[PDB]
Design a protein around this ligand. Structure first.
Ligand SMILES: [Zn+2]
Ligand SMILES: [Zn+2]
Ligand SMILES: [Zn+2]
Length: 571
């Protein structure tokens, strides 16, 4: 019951009992929370409530200080002072944005906009409130019961009555009962057991968690040094990494640094190269996803001592991680760990990659568990953000993804990798104009294997996941005449479309959001629909920037189709 205001940092003992995170408020600000919102319960060592028997008066605007206890207007003694007096609430040591953040439901984009345009402490209140609201609601979907078990990879499901049903994507992970975590893909449903337990009938919940509080800021205050501080540069750096030396120096002359790395521009190369320039430094490589850390591991396995590297895995192990480094050895000079599994340690340089996919919660967790001399944030605000499962009204723009992306979109990034080495020029040219203001350059020539076709087709829906069978049919007609594409990866914005494409075409499939950070020779993309999800420029950017040799885009949107600097196909 001891703390300081979360708005002006004035110590007090008053906590709001209506806020889900019960923050500490001083006497001057508590008055504005209570007199401007619906939040009227104030908490202290003793609940501010009428102490008279049988009274339900909890509104502090209706309460009075009588003697040492608190009473309402119908029970207060003659000599009593109003608790809410002189723009203050009685407490020891005797706001609009805070009010919005405290009263919002996190379903509108404006909520997330405020949560990133506010003060740091407010940013941390919003983050923890959001996570809480996300969790307190994950308990309101129906439960799953197995009708019949057909194969080892497919089941029949029966859903509970009264509650809504959660979608069947990997984003919606489930805990089985403790038979292990499970994911489902949309009659028959495909099941994926983190273990090889033969899911039987009579078996049966959405994963959840407990919102631990936060303490560290999203970004530590910036520090600009006069020279490389805390690190010892080499003087014989491989020529393969020589282009990044001027950037590798800025990292050492600053507390934190921002790198915008468009697709195929060499982000992982910059990351592992930072260690070769500082060969004595302890480096923690972290990201929110397991695939990102594994990508950084695979890159290290080529340029770094395989004996100074460790892949930290959570004891609760769902996906397969990297199995070529020492597992769970925090003592190594090179530690590769997801944010949630971060140990409480120290380092010289911390590298946080895939920053577009980070939440302000993740950023705080890192600035806490990891105390370091230099933090490096690598990503691209023109790529996809982390899913905000409560956001249903409005679109979150890149400047509101997190604090780092806001910086990259407002003041600019500290470093910008401007040469794409992966994609054919046709792709590079298209994205450079679409999201990079023509600042992205192409190293490769035009492949002449980048084609586009405008075909709206027919849109069917499995619940809400979209499907366009006619667009799959067009792809089938294309594969019969382009054999070199039988190895192509099918990519779409919809899981259901991918499922239908797997069966009809036989190609490996991937959603755009799951394709992020992956590269492929040939890519086949069907927009499937003309929706805000299907036409998002970040999503379209990621999708087409996956191809190294060729791409075929079956388009549903006239604008994005015209912008594709590809050869048009007819059929
Ligand atoms: Zn205050
Ligand atoms: Zn409140
Ligand atoms: Zn009373």
């Amino acid at each position: 019951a001891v703390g300081a205001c979360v708005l002006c940092n004035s110590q007090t003992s008053l906590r709001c009992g209506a806020c889900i995170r019960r923050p500490f408020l001083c006497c001057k600000c508590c008055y504005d929370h209570v007199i401007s919102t619906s939040h009227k319960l104030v908490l202290s060592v003793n609940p501010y409530v009428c102490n008279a028997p049988g009274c339900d008066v909890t509104d502090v605007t209706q309460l009075y200080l009588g003697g040492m206890s608190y009473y309402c207007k119908s029970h207060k003694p003659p000599i009593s002072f109003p608790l809410c007096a002189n723009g203050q609430v009685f407490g020891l040591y005797k706001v609009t944005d805070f009010n919005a953040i405290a009263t919002c439901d996190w379903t509108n984009a404006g909520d997330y906009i405020l949560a990133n345009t506010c003060t740091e402490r407010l940013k941390l209140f919003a983050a923890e409130t959001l996570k809480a609201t996300e969790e307190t609601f994950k308990l309101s979907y129906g439960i799953a019961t197995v009708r019949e078990v057909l194969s080892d990879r497919e089941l029949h499901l029966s859903w509970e009555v009264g509650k809504p049903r959660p979608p069947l994507n990997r984003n919606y992970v489930f805990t089985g009962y403790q038979i292990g975590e499970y994911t489902f893909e949309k009659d028959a449903v495909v099941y994926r057991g983190t273990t090889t337990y033969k899911l039987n009938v009579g078996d049966y919940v959405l994963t959840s968690h407990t919102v631990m509080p936060l303490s560290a800021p999203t970004l530590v205050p910036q520090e600009h040094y006069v020279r490389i501080t805390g690190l010892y540069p080499t003087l014989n750096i491989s020529d393969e990494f020589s282009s990044n030396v001027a950037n590798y120096q800025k990292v050492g002359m600053q507390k934190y640094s921002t790198l915008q790395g468009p697709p195929g521009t060499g982000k992982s190369h910059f990351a592992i190269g930072l260690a070769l320039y500082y060969p004595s430094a302890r480096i923690v490589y972290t990201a929110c996803s397991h695939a990102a850390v594994d990508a950084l591991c695979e890159k290290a396995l080529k340029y770094l001592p395989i004996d100074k590297c460790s892949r930290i895995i959570p004891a609760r192990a769902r996906v397969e991680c990297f199995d070529k480094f020492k597992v769970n050895s925090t003592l190594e000079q090179y530690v590769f760990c997801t944010v949630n599994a971060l140990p409480e340690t120290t380092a010289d340089i911390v590298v946080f990659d895939e920053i577009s996919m980070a939440t302000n919660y993740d950023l705080s967790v890192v600035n806490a568990r990891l105390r370091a001399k230099h933090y490096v944030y690598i990503g691209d605000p023109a790529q996809l953000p982390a899913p905000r499962t409560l956001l249903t009204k409005g679109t979150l723009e890149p400047e509101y993804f997190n604090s780092v992306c806001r910086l990259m979109k407002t003041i600019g990034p500290d470093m910008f990798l401007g040469t794409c080495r992966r994609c054919p020029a046709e792709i590079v040219d298209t994205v450079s104009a679409l999201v990079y203001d023509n600042k992205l350059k192409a190293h490769k020539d035009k492949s002449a294997q980048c084609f586009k076709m405008f075909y709206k087709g027919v849109i069917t829906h499995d619940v809400s996941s979209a499907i366009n069978r006619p667009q799959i049919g067009v792809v089938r007609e294309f594969l019969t005449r382009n054999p070199a594409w039988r190895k192509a990866v099918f990519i779409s914005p919809y899981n259901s479309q991918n499922a239908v494409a797997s069966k009809i075409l036989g190609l490996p499939t991937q959603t755009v959001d799951s394709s992020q950070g992956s590269e492929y020779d040939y890519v086949i993309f069907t927009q499937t629909t003309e929706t805000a999800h299907s036409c998002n420029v970040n999503r379209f950017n990621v999708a087409i920037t996956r191809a190294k040799v060729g791409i075929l885009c079956i388009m549903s949107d006239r604008d994005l189709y015209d912008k594709l600097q590809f050869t048009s196909l007819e059929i």
